[PDB]
Design a protein around this ligand. Sequence first.
Ligand SMILES: NC(=O)c1ccc[n+]([C@@H]2O[C@H](COP(=O)([O-])OP(=O)(O)OC[C@H]3O[C@@H](n4cnc5c(N)ncnc54)[C@H](OP(=O)(O)O)[C@@H]3O)[C@H](O)[C@H]2O)c1
Ligand SMILES: NC(=O)c1ccc[n+]([C@@H]2O[C@H](COP(=O)([O-])OP(=O)(O)OC[C@H]3O[C@@H](n4cnc5c(N)ncnc54)[C@H](OP(=O)(O)O)[C@@H]3O)[C@H](O)[C@H]2O)c1
Ligand SMILES: [Mg+2]
Ligand SMILES: [Mg+2]
Lengths: 414, 414
Amino acid sequence: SKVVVPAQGKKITLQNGKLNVPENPIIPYIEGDGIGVDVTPAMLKVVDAAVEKAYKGERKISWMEIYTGEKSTQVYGQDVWLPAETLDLIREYRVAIKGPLTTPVGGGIRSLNVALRQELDLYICLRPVRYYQGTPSPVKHPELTDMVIFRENSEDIFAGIEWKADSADAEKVIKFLREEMGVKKIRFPEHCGIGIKPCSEEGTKRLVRAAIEYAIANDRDSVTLVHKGNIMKFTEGAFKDWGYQLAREEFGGELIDGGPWLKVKNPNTGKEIVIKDVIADAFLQQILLRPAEYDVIACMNLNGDYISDALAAQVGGIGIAPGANIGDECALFEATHGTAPKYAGQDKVNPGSIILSAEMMLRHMGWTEAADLIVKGMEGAINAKTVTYDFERLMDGAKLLKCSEFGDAIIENM
Amino acid sequence: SKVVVPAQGKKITLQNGKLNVPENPIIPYIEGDGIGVDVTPAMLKVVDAAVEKAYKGERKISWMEIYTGEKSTQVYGQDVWLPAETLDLIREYRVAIKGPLTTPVGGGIRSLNVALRQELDLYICLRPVRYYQGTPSPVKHPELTDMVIFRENSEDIFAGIEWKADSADAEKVIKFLREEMGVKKIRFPEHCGIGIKPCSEEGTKRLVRAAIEYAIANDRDSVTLVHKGNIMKFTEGAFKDWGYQLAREEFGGELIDGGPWLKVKNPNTGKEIVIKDVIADAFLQQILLRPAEYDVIACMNLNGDYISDALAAQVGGIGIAPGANIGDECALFEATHGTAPKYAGQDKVNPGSIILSAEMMLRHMGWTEAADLIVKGMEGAINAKTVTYDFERLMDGAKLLKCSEFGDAIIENM
Ligand SMILES: NC(=O)c1ccc[n+]([C@@H]2O[C@H](COP(=O)([O-])OP(=O)(O)OC[C@H]3O[C@@H](n4cnc5c(N)ncnc54)[C@H](OP(=O)(O)O)[C@@H]3O)[C@H](O)[C@H]2O)c1
Ligand SMILES: NC(=O)c1ccc[n+]([C@@H]2O[C@H](COP(=O)([O-])OP(=O)(O)OC[C@H]3O[C@@H](n4cnc5c(N)ncnc54)[C@H](OP(=O)(O)O)[C@@H]3O)[C@H](O)[C@H]2O)c1
Ligand SMILES: [Mg+2]
Ligand SMILES: [Mg+2]
């Protein structure tokens, strides 16, 4: 079983919290299915470029291609979707990036995107949403949005703990719930599917710990812990409580008058981070209406997904939203959208998303220089309204660049 | 125990599917907590008015006040929140309307709004969202939105089947799941809260049956069954399947090419209703972006809540959104927002919501005449931009009417 590791580079090492990043590291990349094949090459080009421009030849990346999804079955024999070589390599190599993956209906396989995340314990799904100036938006003021969404990745209904309607198993479960648990509340027990939803002190606390720290480090204004927690009192309602607990405990939360909101004092800055909560259904409105009062946000798995895609449409770029799956031993950055099964190979989709994800990646390695070079190029291209189809078609005379040509525009604006 | 039933009217009867509505019916109303006290009187005024104007004195309503929430404890002794007199009366009287209710933290009581709905088996939460012309909206084209949200009310995580983190009970459940069910997937079993999520053939099918029928009767264009069903395969993924099944089965769905979408032929009209699906997280974007392609929509409990409040902010009026809880033996219309615990008694909040809900109510009784009178008055007031605070404060010189005065403006525009 083999992936040709490049003879040109050196592994990144995690020397106790410190990510030791060499000058020529091996960073693995999973290509993708559909436009993964378009998108990815645009990414490598702009990344390699940002690296040349910034460090004037000193540093560079030995990209190692790994396999997952469609390609895995082709390379490893169709029956293999997520081989382990891939799981080790991400762990071992420390930082990895990926294009879009598809999960095959038919053979009882759960979401490949979620399989990677759960398996590698990448419990922090980091999703930042902000308005690049000149991006055609459906809302009046897309510029008021600049949020950093911290979504729990290892729990919630998203785990995959469910028994099919009428299976002997679901059947056994209902017998348990009613017979033993006293659940006189499942409305129609016959042919009823059951899903399970967990929330631990551990899972929520480790997530919030991460979120507040991001706030302190980047001097953010607040941390909003969202939860549909007045109905789900012991899962979501406990998300809120443990989060507040943590802010008080580990960070020194002072009460803002009669509660429940806290105050965390930013050591490095003197400013005080407001720790507050907002119920999920009411939050979905608050973000269209008073979006300038939210900054960093902590969520469970389900709401995090919903809030990311909701916030990403208002600021236009559903096609340019970046994402990171972060855990303790490694990290996996990714493209947050499909490949569009009709567009593959046509060199037509917006390659923004994967590009910003590499931007996030490059920043995480400590190459802050190549990072803002990429983001500046991005704004350059967009502002010059010489953009890709998805944007071009809502713009008053934008030049229509293809995927690759767009990557180029980014290099031209660095 | 007593509610003074009015000597002035006659009960509505449900004579087998046909709602026999007298000329002077007794329609019960639950006032509300906080602005329930503002809002409600505005409603009764405009309703009584619509009824005078339309039927020229012939018909009228003997309003019977019932009790739930804060008021219940006052009238019935504080310890009683949802007395049964109230539960019978709604059933017996057939149609009831309500203001906002609050649920007390502290005494282990679940949501009063959800208690009523579950208890009376009002399994259809009907939530229509459309743009009244002149309502200050945060999106560029709030006018493209005209959806009728059919949300499942008796199932989903919303049932209240959960065991607190660390309780002996949750503890027993985890032992079951891992020991007996082979669930090597609850990430941190220690101090983990567990919620339960069911979905029956029965619950989803009865909901979709209702939704499509609404489409046929009102000549709607399509029925979008939404579901986060590629991760929740046996609850949400089964919502989708059973729904399609129903459309094929009971309504005669023909396939649109290679699937999965169907075609239901509107008997009364010749037009063909498209039955399609959209995954939940992708739907939350599609509604900001291509909102004109969605019409009627079927949902489970959780997504229905999220989609209602999401759609209601884009079309501005989060404060004017109406709602209906419909079941087989009775129906309960309601105000879909809070009372704002700082605004109560100040005669300041927008009374739209409760007013439209009575509009919906009046329509359901068969008084289609009083119904569009109210909605025409509504548009009149708003268009004349002589509106309430919440609207007035985003309008270029609107006259600032108080709650009551606004009710009046509605009567002035009929
Ligand atoms: N993180 C991920 O890798 C990820 C996440 C979710 C789903 N997927 C997958 O991708 C698949 C493809 O099918 P779908 O079409 O149903 O996917 P989808 O991702 O929901 O599609 C979103 C659509 O919006 C537009 N948009 C978003 N990405 C764009 C881009 N790169 N360039 C231009 N405009 C963009 C395109 O509109 P048009 O289609 O109209 O051009 C695009 O196809 C499956 O849905 C799913 O397995 C992958
Ligand atoms: N269907 C229901 O009866 C229902 C549903 C949900 C919650 N509630 C309850 O109501 C409570 C009150 O607290 P909350 O303030 O947190 O409630 P909330 O309903 O989330 O508050 C929404 C806020 O948006 C604005 N808005 C919505 N209703 C309005 C109206 N009638 N007039 C003018 N603008 C309007 C007001 O802004 P400002 O507050 O800034 O003025 C309003 O208070 C509890 O949240 C909850 O138990 C009742
Ligand atoms: Mg998602
Ligand atoms: Mg709601």
